[PDB]
Amino acid sequence: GSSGSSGEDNRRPLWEPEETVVIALYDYQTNDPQELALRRNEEYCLLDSSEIHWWRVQDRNGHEGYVPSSYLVEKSPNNLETYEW
Numbered sequence: 001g002s003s004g005s006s007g008e009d010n011r012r013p014l015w016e017p018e019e020t021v022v023i024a025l026y027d028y029q030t031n032d033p034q035e036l037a038l039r040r041n042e043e044y045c046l047l048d049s050s051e052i053h054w055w056r057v058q059d060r061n062g063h064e065g066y067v068p069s070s071y072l073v074e075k076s077p078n079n080l081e082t083y084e085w
Helices: none
Strands: 021-024 042-048 054-058 064-068 072-074
Touching: none
Parallel strands: none
Antiparallel strands: 021 042, 021 072, 042 054, 054 064
16 A cells, blocks of 8 residues: 555544543434434434433534433543543
8 A cells, every 4th residue: 555645644533532422332213302313333422421221412413312321332541541549
């Protein structure tokens, strides 16, 4: 392989390392308005974890609702030296 215009991959993220960002392992679907359909391999801003089985999140476009925390996952840690004790 060979580069073309730029040989330096500087693809920075969008969300913030401070806000809780979760991702859906699978594309969840529902027939209720109160519920939101998650997308496989898609991050989501955690609004409030009031409940346990159901977490309130928001899409990148602006779609919030109740989703199965099971699908949502905590963006694995990286280059972060911190201990929760």
